[PDB]
Amino acid sequence: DRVADVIESSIGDSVSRALTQALPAPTGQNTQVSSHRLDTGEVPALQAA
Amino acid sequence: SDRVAQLTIGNSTITTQEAANIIVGYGEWPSYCSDDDATAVDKPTRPDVSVNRFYTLDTKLWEKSSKGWYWKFPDVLTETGVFGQNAQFHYLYRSGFCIHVQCNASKFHQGALLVAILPEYVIGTVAGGTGTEDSHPPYKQTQPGADGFELQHPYVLDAGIPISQLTVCPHQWINLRTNNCATIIVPYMNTLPFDSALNHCNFGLLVVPISPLDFDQGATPVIPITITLAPMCSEFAGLRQAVTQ
A31 at the B interface (CB within 8 A)? Predict the structure, then answer.
């Protein structure tokens, strides 16, 4: 009765995907305690601009 | 059980057999910085025993004509001891103090020293005498470190304020017929959780003879006054290289 590619055809989605949400930011972010970390595999400081 | 006392901090112990109780500045014991009062995000150093101890920094001679002396504080203890070091290497410093001024004489001597703690003790000049010159007290006068400095116009605490009222500040007297030492315990007091031990002095220690020293001739005339202070709850943050000033 239909042609499948028409039943799927996501053509016509009025809503935007997003990916990000808005969170409450009444105050600046707090700082939690940190301790030394000497381990291989986890590299926060390394980034890729 | 009130005239004798023993103060023990770090590896230092002071004994006294004629003290007149202990004053606790503004009725508050020195505390560490709260998590909600602080801002410096780095975990601080709390050397404890290596810096919280009794440094016996100076001795002055009391004479029938002495005017009085003062010592600015945060500073006085720099360059001397491990405390000094942590104060030079770190930007931020925080700490309360246990100040013990001592001076003894005989039962045949007489006199009375006022020992006060004046917070934010800003020094002023005589303005060139007439008052037309806008002079300013020199580094050697505002931050004398140990050795302190001698007052030139004690009546006004070299800052245009009556010494007659200096007692609204944590004080204690050293009346020779009564005691032989004063003991004030000041908490950290500033409008900030931490500040530079180098360029800011939280308070000054005043030692002024209000009732002149006197004694019949023949009695030992060398009457010293010795300052002994001890930091408490010392905290340091913001580590960089060592700095003198």
Answer: yes
CA A44 to the chain's CA centroid:
17
Dist. CA A22–CA A30, nearest whole Å: 18
Neighbours of B125 (CB within 10 A): 16
Phi-psi region of B152 (alpha: psi -120 to 50; beta: other; left: phi over 0): alpha
- Topology of the domain covering B1-245: Jelly Rolls (2.60.120)
Quickly count: other Cβ atoms within 10 Å of residue B141's Cβ.
15
How far is B228 from B101, CA to CA, in rounded Å? Answer: 6
Q: Which helix (H) or strand (E) holds A5?
A: helix A5-8
The C-alpha atoms of residue A6 and residue B118 are separated, in whole angstroms, by: 85
Alpha carbon of A31: minimum distance to chain B alpha carbons (Å): 7
Q: Where are the domains of chain B?
A: 1-245
Backbone dihedral angles phi then psi of residue B13, each to the nearest 5 degrees = -135, 120
Q: Which two tokens stand for residue B241?
A: 């290289």
d(CA B51, CA B81): 7
